[PDB]
């Protein structure tokens, strides 16, 4: 019983951690080329913040999803 509680605790822990990893790599992939393009064309600042915002939104999709449901488990283990 407490064992299954630890089971769901582990599930949530690895869940949120993996989400953090995916985000922490995707953001870097974005930012590298972001700075590179900025270096190429200093004038294009508005479009580049625009696209960067767009893509940053497109990126994080699943990670914090799993984060949220995992913390829901933390408060309400979705079982006994």
């Amino acid at each position: 019983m407490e064992l299954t509680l630890g089971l769901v605790a582990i599930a949530s822990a690895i869940l949120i951690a993996f989400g953090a990893l995916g985000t922490a790599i995707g953001f870097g992939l974005l930012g590298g080329r972001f700075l590179e393009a900025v270096a190429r064309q200093p004038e294009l600042a508005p479009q580049l913040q625009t696209r960067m915002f767009l893509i940053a939104g497109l990126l994080d999709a699943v990670p914090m999803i799993g984060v949220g449901i995992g913390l829901f488990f933390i408060f309400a283990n979705p079982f006994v």
Binding site: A61, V62, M64, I65, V67, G68, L71
Partner: peptide, 16 residues
């Protein structure tokens, strides 16, 4: 679904 949980998870992380 993803969008709703966007809002929820971010705001939830804040409160926590």
């Amino acid at each position: 679904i993803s969008l709703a949980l966007r809002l929820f998870g971010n705001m939830y992380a804040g409160e926590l």
